[PDB]
Motif scaffolding. Structure first.
Motif, PDB file in Angstrom:
ATOM      1  N   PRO B   9      -5.610  10.639   2.036  1.00  0.00           N
ATOM      2  CA  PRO B   9      -5.528   9.248   2.485  1.00  0.00           C
ATOM      3  C   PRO B   9      -4.828   8.339   1.475  1.00  0.00           C
ATOM      4  O   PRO B   9      -5.458   7.391   1.022  1.00  0.00           O
ATOM      5  N   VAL B  10      -3.582   8.588   1.043  1.00  0.00           N
ATOM      6  CA  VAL B  10      -2.892   7.769   0.051  1.00  0.00           C
ATOM      7  C   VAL B  10      -1.428   7.662   0.517  1.00  0.00           C
ATOM      8  O   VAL B  10      -1.010   8.371   1.442  1.00  0.00           O
ATOM      9  N   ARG B  11      -0.678   6.739  -0.072  1.00  0.00           N
ATOM     10  CA  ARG B  11       0.725   6.620   0.239  1.00  0.00           C
ATOM     11  C   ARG B  11       1.382   7.814  -0.413  1.00  0.00           C
ATOM     12  O   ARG B  11       1.913   8.668   0.301  1.00  0.00           O
ATOM     13  N   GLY B  12       1.342   7.883  -1.758  1.00  0.00           N
ATOM     14  CA  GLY B  12       1.830   9.027  -2.520  1.00  0.00           C
ATOM     15  C   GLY B  12       3.190   9.576  -2.103  1.00  0.00           C
ATOM     16  O   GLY B  12       4.175   8.843  -2.015  1.00  0.00           O
ATOM     17  N   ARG B  13       3.263  10.870  -1.839  1.00  0.00           N
ATOM     18  CA  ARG B  13       4.497  11.541  -1.465  1.00  0.00           C
ATOM     19  C   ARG B  13       4.803  11.489   0.033  1.00  0.00           C
ATOM     20  O   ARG B  13       5.709  12.187   0.481  1.00  0.00           O
ATOM     21  N   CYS B  14       4.074  10.745   0.855  1.00  0.00           N
ATOM     22  CA  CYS B  14       4.354  10.720   2.284  1.00  0.00           C
ATOM     23  C   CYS B  14       4.797   9.370   2.794  1.00  0.00           C
ATOM     24  O   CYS B  14       5.268   9.293   3.929  1.00  0.00           O
ATOM     25  N   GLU B  15       4.773   8.310   1.991  1.00  0.00           N
ATOM     26  CA  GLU B  15       5.128   6.999   2.496  1.00  0.00           C
ATOM     27  C   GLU B  15       6.599   6.894   2.758  1.00  0.00           C
ATOM     28  O   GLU B  15       6.898   6.265   3.762  1.00  0.00           O
ATOM     29  N   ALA B  16       7.515   7.516   2.017  1.00  0.00           N
ATOM     30  CA  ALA B  16       8.931   7.514   2.384  1.00  0.00           C
ATOM     31  C   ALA B  16       9.165   8.260   3.699  1.00  0.00           C
ATOM     32  O   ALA B  16       9.948   7.762   4.520  1.00  0.00           O
ATOM     33  N   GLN B  24      13.137   5.314  12.626  1.00  0.00           N
ATOM     34  CA  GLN B  24      13.926   5.992  13.631  1.00  0.00           C
ATOM     35  C   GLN B  24      13.242   6.018  14.992  1.00  0.00           C
ATOM     36  O   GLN B  24      13.623   6.798  15.872  1.00  0.00           O
ATOM     37  N   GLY B  25      12.216   5.183  15.142  1.00  0.00           N
ATOM     38  CA  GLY B  25      11.456   5.028  16.362  1.00  0.00           C
ATOM     39  C   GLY B  25      10.630   6.241  16.777  1.00  0.00           C
ATOM     40  O   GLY B  25      10.402   6.452  17.978  1.00  0.00           O
ATOM     41  N   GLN B  26      10.165   7.047  15.823  1.00  0.00           N
ATOM     42  CA  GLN B  26       9.403   8.240  16.143  1.00  0.00           C
ATOM     43  C   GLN B  26       7.931   7.943  15.972  1.00  0.00           C
ATOM     44  O   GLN B  26       7.536   6.999  15.290  1.00  0.00           O
ATOM     45  N   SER B  27       7.085   8.734  16.593  1.00  0.00           N
ATOM     46  CA  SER B  27       5.662   8.582  16.403  1.00  0.00           C
ATOM     47  C   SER B  27       5.228   9.926  15.846  1.00  0.00           C
ATOM     48  O   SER B  27       5.905  10.958  16.007  1.00  0.00           O
ATOM     49  N   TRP B  28       4.102   9.896  15.155  1.00  0.00           N
ATOM     50  CA  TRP B  28       3.608  11.099  14.535  1.00  0.00           C
ATOM     51  C   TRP B  28       2.107  10.955  14.513  1.00  0.00           C
ATOM     52  O   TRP B  28       1.603   9.839  14.695  1.00  0.00           O
ATOM     53  N   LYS B  29       1.423  12.054  14.236  1.00  0.00           N
ATOM     54  CA  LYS B  29      -0.017  12.060  14.070  1.00  0.00           C
ATOM     55  C   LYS B  29      -0.325  12.216  12.575  1.00  0.00           C
ATOM     56  O   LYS B  29       0.330  12.960  11.828  1.00  0.00           O
ATOM     57  N   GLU B  30      -1.318  11.484  12.105  1.00  0.00           N
ATOM     58  CA  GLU B  30      -1.811  11.571  10.732  1.00  0.00           C
ATOM     59  C   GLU B  30      -3.047  12.442  10.736  1.00  0.00           C
ATOM     60  O   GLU B  30      -4.046  12.077  11.357  1.00  0.00           O
ATOM     61  N   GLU B  31      -3.038  13.594  10.115  1.00  0.00           N
ATOM     62  CA  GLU B  31      -4.244  14.379   9.982  1.00  0.00           C
ATOM     63  C   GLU B  31      -4.669  14.103   8.526  1.00  0.00           C
ATOM     64  O   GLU B  31      -3.975  14.488   7.583  1.00  0.00           O
ATOM     65  N   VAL B  32      -5.753  13.352   8.301  1.00  0.00           N
ATOM     66  CA  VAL B  32      -6.224  13.007   6.957  1.00  0.00           C
ATOM     67  C   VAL B  32      -7.218  14.014   6.362  1.00  0.00           C
ATOM     68  O   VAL B  32      -8.180  14.441   7.005  1.00  0.00           O
ATOM     69  N   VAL B  33      -6.955  14.480   5.142  1.00  0.00           N
ATOM     70  CA  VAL B  33      -7.828  15.420   4.436  1.00  0.00           C
ATOM     71  C   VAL B  33      -8.495  14.577   3.370  1.00  0.00           C
ATOM     72  O   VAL B  33      -7.773  13.962   2.580  1.00  0.00           O
ATOM     73  N   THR B  34      -9.813  14.488   3.296  1.00  0.00           N
ATOM     74  CA  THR B  34     -10.404  13.756   2.203  1.00  0.00           C
ATOM     75  C   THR B  34     -10.497  14.660   0.990  1.00  0.00           C
ATOM     76  O   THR B  34     -10.560  15.889   1.106  1.00  0.00           O
ATOM     77  N   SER B 195       1.746  -3.147   8.469  1.00  0.00           N
ATOM     78  CA  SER B 195       0.670  -2.599   9.265  1.00  0.00           C
ATOM     79  C   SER B 195      -0.587  -2.325   8.418  1.00  0.00           C
ATOM     80  O   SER B 195      -0.501  -1.957   7.232  1.00  0.00           O
ATOM     81  N   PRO B 196      -1.823  -2.496   8.903  1.00  0.00           N
ATOM     82  CA  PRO B 196      -3.027  -2.232   8.117  1.00  0.00           C
ATOM     83  C   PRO B 196      -3.103  -0.766   7.689  1.00  0.00           C
ATOM     84  O   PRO B 196      -3.634  -0.481   6.627  1.00  0.00           O
ATOM     85  N   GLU B 197      -2.499   0.179   8.433  1.00  0.00           N
ATOM     86  CA  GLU B 197      -2.478   1.613   8.113  1.00  0.00           C
ATOM     87  C   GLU B 197      -1.815   1.767   6.763  1.00  0.00           C
ATOM     88  O   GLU B 197      -2.356   2.399   5.877  1.00  0.00           O
ATOM     89  N   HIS B 198      -0.661   1.139   6.590  1.00  0.00           N
ATOM     90  CA  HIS B 198       0.037   1.155   5.334  1.00  0.00           C
ATOM     91  C   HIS B 198      -0.670   0.331   4.307  1.00  0.00           C
ATOM     92  O   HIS B 198      -0.838   0.780   3.186  1.00  0.00           O
ATOM     93  N   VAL B 199      -1.019  -0.912   4.649  1.00  0.00           N
ATOM     94  CA  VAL B 199      -1.566  -1.845   3.687  1.00  0.00           C
ATOM     95  C   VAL B 199      -2.887  -1.374   3.131  1.00  0.00           C
ATOM     96  O   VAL B 199      -3.170  -1.546   1.945  1.00  0.00           O
ATOM     97  N   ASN B 200      -3.682  -0.755   3.982  1.00  0.00           N
ATOM     98  CA  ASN B 200      -5.003  -0.355   3.556  1.00  0.00           C
ATOM     99  C   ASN B 200      -4.974   0.998   2.889  1.00  0.00           C
ATOM    100  O   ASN B 200      -6.012   1.419   2.390  1.00  0.00           O
ATOM    101  N   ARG B 201      -3.830   1.674   2.811  1.00  0.00           N
ATOM    102  CA  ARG B 201      -3.794   2.993   2.228  1.00  0.00           C
ATOM    103  C   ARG B 201      -3.520   2.776   0.743  1.00  0.00           C
ATOM    104  O   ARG B 201      -2.595   2.033   0.415  1.00  0.00           O
ATOM    105  N   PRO B 202      -4.297   3.277  -0.235  1.00  0.00           N
ATOM    106  CA  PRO B 202      -3.969   3.125  -1.647  1.00  0.00           C
ATOM    107  C   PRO B 202      -2.660   3.816  -1.991  1.00  0.00           C
ATOM    108  O   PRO B 202      -2.327   4.805  -1.348  1.00  0.00           O
TER     109      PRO B 202
END
Ligand SMILES: N[C@@H](CCC(=O)N[C@@H](CS(=O)(=O)O)C(=O)NCC(=O)O)C(=O)O
Ligand SMILES: N[C@@H](CCC(=O)N[C@@H](CS(=O)(=O)O)C(=O)NCC(=O)O)C(=O)O
Lengths: 209, 209
Positions: B9-16, B24-34, B195-202
Protein backbone atom coordinates in the motif's frame (compact mmCIF):
# COMPACT_ATOMS: atom_id res chain seq x y z
CA UNK A 1 27.91 1.24 -37.04
CA UNK A 2 30.87 1.99 -36.67
CA UNK A 3 30.86 1.00 -32.92
CA UNK A 4 33.23 2.41 -30.30
CA UNK A 5 33.21 1.41 -26.62
CA UNK A 6 34.79 3.95 -24.23
CA UNK A 7 35.60 2.42 -20.78
CA UNK A 8 38.06 1.66 -18.02
CA UNK A 9 40.48 -1.27 -18.69
CA UNK A 10 38.15 -3.82 -17.00
CA UNK A 11 35.48 -6.28 -18.09
CA UNK A 12 32.89 -4.84 -15.70
CA UNK A 13 29.69 -3.58 -17.29
CA UNK A 14 31.06 -3.92 -20.84
CA UNK A 15 31.96 -7.61 -21.28
CA UNK A 16 28.37 -8.70 -22.09
CA UNK A 17 28.12 -6.10 -24.88
CA UNK A 18 31.61 -7.15 -26.19
CA UNK A 19 30.44 -10.78 -26.33
CA UNK A 20 27.18 -9.77 -28.08
CA UNK A 21 29.08 -7.82 -30.76
CA UNK A 22 31.65 -10.63 -31.20
CA UNK A 23 28.96 -13.30 -31.51
CA UNK A 24 27.08 -11.19 -34.06
CA UNK A 25 30.25 -10.88 -36.17
CA UNK A 26 30.60 -7.13 -35.56
CA UNK A 27 33.87 -5.35 -35.07
CA UNK A 28 34.23 -2.34 -32.68
CA UNK A 29 36.92 0.14 -31.59
CA UNK A 30 37.92 0.08 -27.93
CA UNK A 31 38.85 3.44 -26.46
CA UNK A 32 40.45 2.61 -23.10
CA UNK A 33 40.45 5.24 -20.40
CA UNK A 34 43.16 4.81 -17.75
CA UNK A 35 42.46 5.99 -14.19
CA UNK A 36 45.12 8.70 -14.53
CA UNK A 37 43.26 10.08 -17.56
CA UNK A 38 39.87 9.85 -15.85
CA UNK A 39 41.30 11.62 -12.83
CA UNK A 40 42.53 14.56 -15.04
CA UNK A 41 38.80 15.51 -14.93
CA UNK A 42 38.35 16.48 -18.62
CA UNK A 43 36.26 13.54 -19.85
CA UNK A 44 33.92 12.98 -16.89
CA UNK A 45 32.04 16.33 -17.18
CA UNK A 46 31.24 15.60 -20.86
CA UNK A 47 29.65 12.26 -19.87
CA UNK A 48 25.90 12.66 -19.40
CA UNK A 49 25.73 11.07 -15.95
CA UNK A 50 29.52 11.58 -15.29
CA UNK A 51 30.25 7.83 -15.82
CA UNK A 52 31.44 5.28 -18.34
CA UNK A 53 30.66 3.26 -20.51
CA UNK A 54 30.19 5.67 -23.35
CA UNK A 55 29.21 3.99 -26.65
CA UNK A 56 29.13 5.48 -30.16
CA UNK A 57 27.08 3.84 -32.84
CA UNK A 58 27.95 6.04 -35.81
CA UNK A 59 25.90 9.10 -35.16
CA UNK A 60 24.45 8.09 -31.76
CA UNK A 61 26.23 8.47 -28.44
CA UNK A 62 24.75 6.48 -25.61
CA UNK A 63 25.46 6.13 -21.91
CA UNK A 64 24.14 3.45 -19.50
CA UNK A 65 25.36 -0.10 -20.17
CA UNK A 66 21.85 -1.71 -20.19
CA UNK A 67 20.52 1.01 -22.59
CA UNK A 68 23.47 0.16 -24.88
CA UNK A 69 22.60 -3.55 -24.58
CA UNK A 70 18.88 -2.94 -25.34
CA UNK A 71 19.94 -0.72 -28.33
CA UNK A 72 22.14 -3.54 -29.74
CA UNK A 73 19.34 -6.09 -29.14
CA UNK A 74 16.86 -3.81 -30.90
CA UNK A 75 19.08 -2.96 -33.83
CA UNK A 76 20.60 -6.39 -34.43
CA UNK A 77 17.39 -8.37 -34.01
CA UNK A 78 18.09 -9.81 -30.53
CA UNK A 79 14.95 -8.63 -28.74
CA UNK A 80 12.45 -11.42 -29.40
CA UNK A 81 9.90 -12.11 -32.04
CA UNK A 82 7.00 -10.41 -30.28
CA UNK A 83 6.03 -8.11 -27.39
CA UNK A 84 5.49 -10.90 -24.87
CA UNK A 85 9.05 -12.12 -25.46
CA UNK A 86 10.39 -8.56 -25.29
CA UNK A 87 8.63 -8.01 -21.96
CA UNK A 88 10.09 -11.32 -20.61
CA UNK A 89 13.64 -10.39 -21.79
CA UNK A 90 13.38 -7.08 -19.93
CA UNK A 91 12.25 -8.91 -16.75
CA UNK A 92 15.27 -11.23 -17.10
CA UNK A 93 17.76 -8.42 -17.78
CA UNK A 94 16.50 -6.39 -14.83
CA UNK A 95 16.89 -9.43 -12.50
CA UNK A 96 20.46 -9.81 -13.90
CA UNK A 97 21.21 -6.19 -13.22
CA UNK A 98 19.87 -6.46 -9.59
CA UNK A 99 22.26 -9.30 -8.84
CA UNK A 100 25.16 -7.53 -10.68
CA UNK A 101 24.49 -4.48 -8.43
CA UNK A 102 24.88 -6.67 -5.33
CA UNK A 103 27.99 -8.38 -6.77
CA UNK A 104 29.62 -4.97 -7.45
CA UNK A 105 28.90 -3.77 -3.88
CA UNK A 106 30.54 -6.99 -2.49
CA UNK A 107 33.65 -6.66 -4.67
CA UNK A 108 34.32 -3.00 -4.07
CA UNK A 109 33.01 -2.41 -0.54
CA UNK A 110 33.08 -5.61 1.57
CA UNK A 111 34.93 -8.39 -0.18
CA UNK A 112 36.96 -9.90 2.63
CA UNK A 113 34.25 -10.03 5.27
CA UNK A 114 31.11 -10.23 3.10
CA UNK A 115 32.15 -12.96 0.62
CA UNK A 116 31.02 -15.82 2.92
CA UNK A 117 27.48 -14.63 3.49
CA UNK A 118 27.19 -13.56 -0.18
CA UNK A 119 28.12 -16.99 -1.49
CA UNK A 120 25.75 -18.47 1.14
CA UNK A 121 22.88 -16.39 -0.22
CA UNK A 122 23.67 -16.88 -3.88
CA UNK A 123 21.53 -20.07 -4.59
CA UNK A 124 18.40 -18.09 -3.79
CA UNK A 125 19.45 -15.42 -6.27
CA UNK A 126 20.26 -18.01 -8.95
CA UNK A 127 17.18 -20.07 -8.57
CA UNK A 128 14.88 -17.55 -10.60
CA UNK A 129 17.05 -18.15 -13.71
CA UNK A 130 16.95 -21.90 -13.29
CA UNK A 131 13.12 -21.69 -13.03
CA UNK A 132 12.91 -19.57 -16.19
CA UNK A 133 15.06 -22.03 -18.17
CA UNK A 134 12.99 -25.05 -17.00
CA UNK A 135 9.83 -23.23 -18.12
CA UNK A 136 11.38 -22.67 -21.58
CA UNK A 137 11.65 -25.84 -23.62
CA UNK A 138 12.97 -27.67 -20.58
CA UNK A 139 16.14 -25.55 -20.51
CA UNK A 140 17.43 -26.64 -23.90
CA UNK A 141 17.35 -23.30 -25.75
CA UNK A 142 17.79 -19.64 -24.53
CA UNK A 143 16.56 -17.77 -21.47
CA UNK A 144 13.48 -16.51 -23.42
CA UNK A 145 12.21 -18.13 -26.62
CA UNK A 146 13.98 -20.00 -29.32
CA UNK A 147 16.65 -17.45 -30.26
CA UNK A 148 19.52 -15.70 -28.52
CA UNK A 149 18.83 -12.21 -27.14
CA UNK A 150 20.76 -9.39 -25.50
CA UNK A 151 19.56 -10.84 -22.15
CA UNK A 152 21.38 -14.18 -22.75
CA UNK A 153 24.73 -12.34 -23.17
CA UNK A 154 24.23 -10.39 -19.94
CA UNK A 155 23.14 -13.53 -17.95
CA UNK A 156 26.10 -15.55 -19.33
CA UNK A 157 28.56 -12.83 -18.25
CA UNK A 158 26.92 -12.67 -14.81
CA UNK A 159 27.23 -16.47 -14.40
CA UNK A 160 30.81 -16.59 -15.72
CA UNK A 161 32.03 -14.06 -13.09
CA UNK A 162 30.04 -15.86 -10.37
CA UNK A 163 31.82 -19.09 -11.20
CA UNK A 164 35.16 -17.27 -10.65
CA UNK A 165 33.85 -16.04 -7.24
CA UNK A 166 32.35 -19.34 -6.06
CA UNK A 167 33.49 -22.21 -8.29
CA UNK A 168 30.76 -24.70 -7.38
CA UNK A 169 27.84 -22.20 -7.40
CA UNK A 170 26.09 -23.87 -10.37
CA UNK A 171 26.54 -27.51 -9.19
CA UNK A 172 23.01 -27.61 -7.96
CA UNK A 173 21.59 -25.83 -11.04
CA UNK A 174 21.75 -28.36 -13.88
CA UNK A 175 20.01 -26.20 -16.52
CA UNK A 176 22.19 -23.15 -15.74
CA UNK A 177 25.28 -25.38 -15.88
CA UNK A 178 24.36 -26.77 -19.25
CA UNK A 179 23.32 -23.33 -20.53
CA UNK A 180 26.70 -21.71 -19.61
CA UNK A 181 28.52 -24.66 -21.21
CA UNK A 182 26.37 -24.48 -24.33
CA UNK A 183 26.62 -20.74 -24.88
CA UNK A 184 30.36 -20.61 -24.06
CA UNK A 185 30.87 -23.16 -26.85
CA UNK A 186 29.31 -20.91 -29.56
CA UNK A 187 32.21 -20.48 -32.04
CA UNK A 188 32.51 -16.72 -31.88
CA UNK A 189 31.96 -16.59 -28.07
CA UNK A 190 34.64 -19.33 -27.41
CA UNK A 191 37.00 -17.35 -29.68
CA UNK A 192 36.26 -14.06 -27.84
CA UNK A 193 36.71 -15.71 -24.44
CA UNK A 194 40.15 -17.01 -25.44
CA UNK A 195 41.18 -13.67 -26.97
CA UNK A 196 44.14 -11.88 -25.22
CA UNK A 197 42.01 -8.65 -25.00
CA UNK A 198 39.42 -10.53 -22.98
CA UNK A 199 41.94 -12.68 -21.04
CA UNK A 200 44.28 -9.84 -20.10
CA UNK A 201 41.46 -7.69 -18.86
CA UNK A 202 40.72 -7.82 -15.07
CA UNK A 203 37.08 -8.52 -14.19
CA UNK A 204 36.91 -5.64 -11.74
CA UNK A 205 39.00 -2.57 -11.10
CA UNK A 206 40.38 -3.33 -7.55
CA UNK A 207 41.93 -6.75 -8.22
CA UNK A 208 39.22 -8.79 -6.49
CA UNK A 209 37.24 -11.54 -8.22
CA UNK B 1 -5.74 -6.26 -20.53
CA UNK B 2 -7.29 -6.73 -17.89
CA UNK B 3 -4.53 -4.97 -15.87
CA UNK B 4 -3.76 -5.85 -12.23
CA UNK B 5 -1.00 -4.35 -10.04
CA UNK B 6 -0.09 -6.39 -6.93
CA UNK B 7 1.89 -4.23 -4.50
CA UNK B 8 2.25 -2.97 -0.98
CA UNK B 9 0.00 0.00 0.00
CA UNK B 10 2.61 2.70 -0.97
CA UNK B 11 3.39 4.84 -4.01
CA UNK B 12 6.98 3.54 -4.24
CA UNK B 13 7.83 1.81 -7.53
CA UNK B 14 4.24 1.73 -8.88
CA UNK B 15 3.14 5.37 -8.94
CA UNK B 16 4.78 6.09 -12.33
CA UNK B 17 2.97 3.07 -13.96
CA UNK B 18 -0.34 4.18 -12.29
CA UNK B 19 0.11 7.68 -13.78
CA UNK B 20 0.89 6.15 -17.23
CA UNK B 21 -2.25 3.97 -17.14
CA UNK B 22 -4.43 6.88 -15.93
CA UNK B 23 -3.08 9.23 -18.60
CA UNK B 24 -3.73 6.65 -21.33
CA UNK B 25 -7.32 6.20 -20.17
CA UNK B 26 -6.85 2.64 -18.89
CA UNK B 27 -8.32 1.11 -15.78
CA UNK B 28 -6.63 -1.46 -13.64
CA UNK B 29 -7.23 -3.37 -10.44
CA UNK B 30 -5.12 -2.76 -7.31
CA UNK B 31 -4.44 -5.95 -5.38
CA UNK B 32 -2.96 -4.65 -2.06
CA UNK B 33 -0.56 -6.85 -0.02
CA UNK B 34 -0.08 -5.62 3.54
CA UNK B 35 3.28 -5.90 5.26
CA UNK B 36 1.85 -8.32 7.89
CA UNK B 37 0.57 -10.58 5.15
CA UNK B 38 3.94 -10.32 3.36
CA UNK B 39 5.75 -11.33 6.55
CA UNK B 40 3.77 -14.51 6.83
CA UNK B 41 6.10 -15.75 3.97
CA UNK B 42 3.43 -17.46 1.79
CA UNK B 43 3.37 -15.08 -1.24
CA UNK B 44 7.05 -14.17 -1.44
CA UNK B 45 8.16 -17.69 -2.70
CA UNK B 46 5.64 -17.49 -5.57
CA UNK B 47 7.19 -14.19 -6.82
CA UNK B 48 9.99 -14.77 -9.40
CA UNK B 49 12.61 -12.67 -7.58
CA UNK B 50 10.84 -12.86 -4.20
CA UNK B 51 9.65 -9.24 -4.62
CA UNK B 52 6.78 -6.96 -5.65
CA UNK B 53 5.51 -5.26 -7.89
CA UNK B 54 3.79 -8.07 -9.66
CA UNK B 55 1.73 -7.01 -12.69
CA UNK B 56 -0.79 -8.96 -14.78
CA UNK B 57 -1.73 -7.99 -18.29
CA UNK B 58 -4.25 -10.54 -19.44
CA UNK B 59 -2.40 -13.84 -19.36
CA UNK B 60 1.09 -12.22 -19.13
CA UNK B 61 2.42 -11.98 -15.57
CA UNK B 62 5.43 -9.69 -15.08
CA UNK B 63 7.77 -8.65 -12.26
CA UNK B 64 10.33 -5.80 -12.12
CA UNK B 65 8.95 -2.24 -12.16
CA UNK B 66 11.00 -1.07 -15.19
CA UNK B 67 10.19 -4.19 -17.29
CA UNK B 68 6.47 -3.45 -16.49
CA UNK B 69 6.94 0.23 -17.56
CA UNK B 70 8.78 -0.79 -20.80
CA UNK B 71 6.06 -3.34 -21.59
CA UNK B 72 3.31 -0.72 -21.15
CA UNK B 73 5.46 1.73 -23.19
CA UNK B 74 5.76 -0.83 -26.01
CA UNK B 75 2.17 -1.98 -26.07
CA UNK B 76 0.53 1.49 -25.76
CA UNK B 77 2.87 3.21 -28.25
CA UNK B 78 4.84 5.27 -25.68
CA UNK B 79 8.32 4.25 -26.77
CA UNK B 80 9.26 6.73 -29.54
CA UNK B 81 8.90 6.94 -33.30
CA UNK B 82 12.16 5.07 -34.14
CA UNK B 83 15.17 3.20 -32.79
CA UNK B 84 17.26 6.28 -31.97
CA UNK B 85 14.41 7.63 -29.75
CA UNK B 86 13.91 4.21 -28.10
CA UNK B 87 17.61 4.09 -27.10
CA UNK B 88 17.53 7.67 -25.79
CA UNK B 89 14.47 6.84 -23.71
CA UNK B 90 16.21 3.76 -22.24
CA UNK B 91 19.25 5.96 -21.36
CA UNK B 92 16.91 8.46 -19.65
CA UNK B 93 14.92 5.73 -17.79
CA UNK B 94 18.16 4.04 -16.57
CA UNK B 95 19.38 7.46 -15.28
CA UNK B 96 16.05 7.83 -13.40
CA UNK B 97 16.40 4.32 -11.91
CA UNK B 98 19.93 5.08 -10.71
CA UNK B 99 18.75 8.12 -8.77
CA UNK B 100 15.64 6.25 -7.58
CA UNK B 101 17.96 3.52 -6.12
CA UNK B 102 19.93 6.24 -4.24
CA UNK B 103 16.72 7.75 -2.94
CA UNK B 104 15.41 4.33 -1.72
CA UNK B 105 18.70 3.78 0.17
CA UNK B 106 18.52 7.17 1.82
CA UNK B 107 14.88 6.71 2.86
CA UNK B 108 15.17 3.17 4.16
CA UNK B 109 18.67 2.98 5.57
CA UNK B 110 19.97 6.46 6.39
CA UNK B 111 17.42 9.23 6.50
CA UNK B 112 18.26 11.23 9.62
CA UNK B 113 22.02 11.05 9.07
CA UNK B 114 22.30 11.19 5.28
CA UNK B 115 19.56 13.67 4.18
CA UNK B 116 21.59 16.86 4.26
CA UNK B 117 24.35 15.24 2.29
CA UNK B 118 21.93 13.77 -0.25
CA UNK B 119 20.26 17.15 -0.87
CA UNK B 120 23.72 18.82 -1.24
CA UNK B 121 24.61 16.25 -3.90
CA UNK B 122 21.19 16.32 -5.63
CA UNK B 123 21.72 19.30 -8.11
CA UNK B 124 24.60 17.34 -9.63
CA UNK B 125 22.25 14.43 -10.13
CA UNK B 126 19.44 16.59 -11.62
CA UNK B 127 21.50 18.61 -14.06
CA UNK B 128 21.66 15.71 -16.68
CA UNK B 129 17.89 15.87 -17.03
CA UNK B 130 17.86 19.66 -17.43
CA UNK B 131 20.53 19.32 -20.22
CA UNK B 132 18.49 16.57 -21.92
CA UNK B 133 15.46 18.89 -21.92
CA UNK B 134 17.48 21.84 -23.29
CA UNK B 135 18.67 19.64 -26.17
CA UNK B 136 15.07 18.65 -26.99
CA UNK B 137 13.33 21.65 -28.62
CA UNK B 138 14.67 23.94 -25.86
CA UNK B 139 12.82 22.01 -23.16
CA UNK B 140 9.35 22.81 -24.44
CA UNK B 141 8.29 19.19 -25.28
CA UNK B 142 8.91 15.82 -23.55
CA UNK B 143 12.19 14.33 -22.33
CA UNK B 144 12.83 12.62 -25.69
CA UNK B 145 11.05 13.47 -28.98
CA UNK B 146 7.72 15.22 -29.35
CA UNK B 147 5.41 12.58 -27.85
CA UNK B 148 5.13 11.53 -24.15
CA UNK B 149 6.83 8.15 -23.43
CA UNK B 150 7.09 5.67 -20.51
CA UNK B 151 10.25 7.53 -19.40
CA UNK B 152 8.38 10.86 -18.89
CA UNK B 153 6.10 9.24 -16.31
CA UNK B 154 9.06 7.76 -14.48
CA UNK B 155 10.99 11.05 -14.49
CA UNK B 156 7.84 12.95 -13.42
CA UNK B 157 7.34 10.67 -10.36
CA UNK B 158 11.03 10.94 -9.38
CA UNK B 159 10.95 14.77 -9.48
CA UNK B 160 7.66 14.95 -7.53
CA UNK B 161 8.95 12.81 -4.61
CA UNK B 162 12.24 14.85 -4.57
CA UNK B 163 10.24 18.08 -4.27
CA UNK B 164 8.69 16.55 -1.09
CA UNK B 165 12.15 15.57 0.17
CA UNK B 166 13.90 18.86 -0.74
CA UNK B 167 11.30 21.59 -1.35
CA UNK B 168 12.92 24.03 -3.78
CA UNK B 169 15.37 21.51 -5.31
CA UNK B 170 14.07 22.49 -8.80
CA UNK B 171 14.55 26.23 -8.13
CA UNK B 172 17.71 26.42 -10.17
CA UNK B 173 16.41 24.11 -12.88
CA UNK B 174 13.93 26.22 -14.92
CA UNK B 175 13.21 23.66 -17.67
CA UNK B 176 12.58 20.83 -15.12
CA UNK B 177 10.29 23.13 -13.05
CA UNK B 178 8.31 23.97 -16.17
CA UNK B 179 8.30 20.34 -17.24
CA UNK B 180 6.82 19.17 -13.92
CA UNK B 181 4.24 21.94 -14.12
CA UNK B 182 3.25 21.07 -17.72
CA UNK B 183 2.98 17.29 -17.33
CA UNK B 184 1.19 17.73 -13.95
CA UNK B 185 -1.42 19.95 -15.65
CA UNK B 186 -2.33 17.17 -18.15
CA UNK B 187 -6.02 16.59 -17.20
CA UNK B 188 -5.87 12.85 -16.49
CA UNK B 189 -2.63 13.22 -14.49
CA UNK B 190 -4.13 16.23 -12.63
CA UNK B 191 -7.13 14.11 -11.74
CA UNK B 192 -4.98 11.21 -10.61
CA UNK B 193 -2.76 13.37 -8.41
CA UNK B 194 -5.71 14.78 -6.58
CA UNK B 195 -7.48 11.46 -6.12
CA UNK B 196 -7.70 10.22 -2.44
CA UNK B 197 -6.27 6.83 -3.66
CA UNK B 198 -3.07 8.62 -4.58
CA UNK B 199 -3.17 11.25 -1.87
CA UNK B 200 -3.83 8.84 0.92
CA UNK B 201 -1.15 6.39 -0.21
CA UNK B 202 2.21 7.04 1.61
CA UNK B 203 5.22 7.60 -0.73
CA UNK B 204 7.39 5.01 1.08
CA UNK B 205 6.72 2.06 3.42
CA UNK B 206 8.56 3.38 6.47
CA UNK B 207 6.69 6.59 6.82
CA UNK B 208 9.71 8.78 5.80
CA UNK B 209 9.71 11.15 2.79
N1 LIG C 1 24.37 2.77 -14.44
C1 LIG C 1 25.64 2.95 -15.06
C2 LIG C 1 26.72 2.66 -14.06
C3 LIG C 1 28.08 3.04 -14.65
C4 LIG C 1 29.15 3.04 -13.60
O1 LIG C 1 28.94 2.70 -12.43
N2 LIG C 1 30.30 3.49 -14.06
C5 LIG C 1 31.48 3.55 -13.23
C6 LIG C 1 32.53 2.54 -13.64
S1 LIG C 1 32.09 0.79 -13.51
O2 LIG C 1 31.55 0.48 -12.21
O3 LIG C 1 31.11 0.42 -14.50
O4 LIG C 1 33.30 0.06 -13.73
C7 LIG C 1 32.11 4.89 -13.40
O5 LIG C 1 32.12 5.40 -14.53
N3 LIG C 1 32.69 5.43 -12.34
C8 LIG C 1 33.48 6.61 -12.53
C9 LIG C 1 33.02 7.73 -11.65
O6 LIG C 1 31.96 7.59 -11.03
O7 LIG C 1 33.75 8.71 -11.58
C10 LIG C 1 25.68 1.96 -16.20
O8 LIG C 1 24.92 1.00 -16.17
O9 LIG C 1 26.43 2.18 -17.13
N1 LIG D 1 14.10 -4.32 -9.01
C1 LIG D 1 12.83 -4.49 -8.34
C2 LIG D 1 12.89 -3.96 -6.90
C3 LIG D 1 11.62 -4.44 -6.19
C4 LIG D 1 11.61 -4.20 -4.71
O1 LIG D 1 12.56 -3.60 -4.20
N2 LIG D 1 10.54 -4.62 -4.01
C5 LIG D 1 10.38 -4.47 -2.56
C6 LIG D 1 9.25 -3.51 -2.19
S1 LIG D 1 9.49 -1.76 -2.60
O2 LIG D 1 10.75 -1.25 -2.09
O3 LIG D 1 9.55 -1.67 -4.04
O4 LIG D 1 8.41 -1.02 -2.01
C7 LIG D 1 9.97 -5.79 -1.94
O5 LIG D 1 9.25 -6.54 -2.60
N3 LIG D 1 10.38 -6.07 -0.70
C8 LIG D 1 9.92 -7.25 0.04
C9 LIG D 1 11.03 -8.28 0.21
O6 LIG D 1 12.13 -8.12 -0.31
O7 LIG D 1 10.78 -9.29 0.84
C10 LIG D 1 11.87 -3.65 -9.18
O8 LIG D 1 12.31 -2.65 -9.76
O9 LIG D 1 10.73 -4.09 -9.30
Amino acid sequence: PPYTIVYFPVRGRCEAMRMLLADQGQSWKEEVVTIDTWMQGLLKPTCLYGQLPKFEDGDLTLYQSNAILRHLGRSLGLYGKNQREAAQMDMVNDGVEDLRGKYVTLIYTNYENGKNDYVKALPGHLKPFETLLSQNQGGKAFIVGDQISFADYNLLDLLLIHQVLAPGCLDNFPLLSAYVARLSARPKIKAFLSSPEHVNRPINGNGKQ
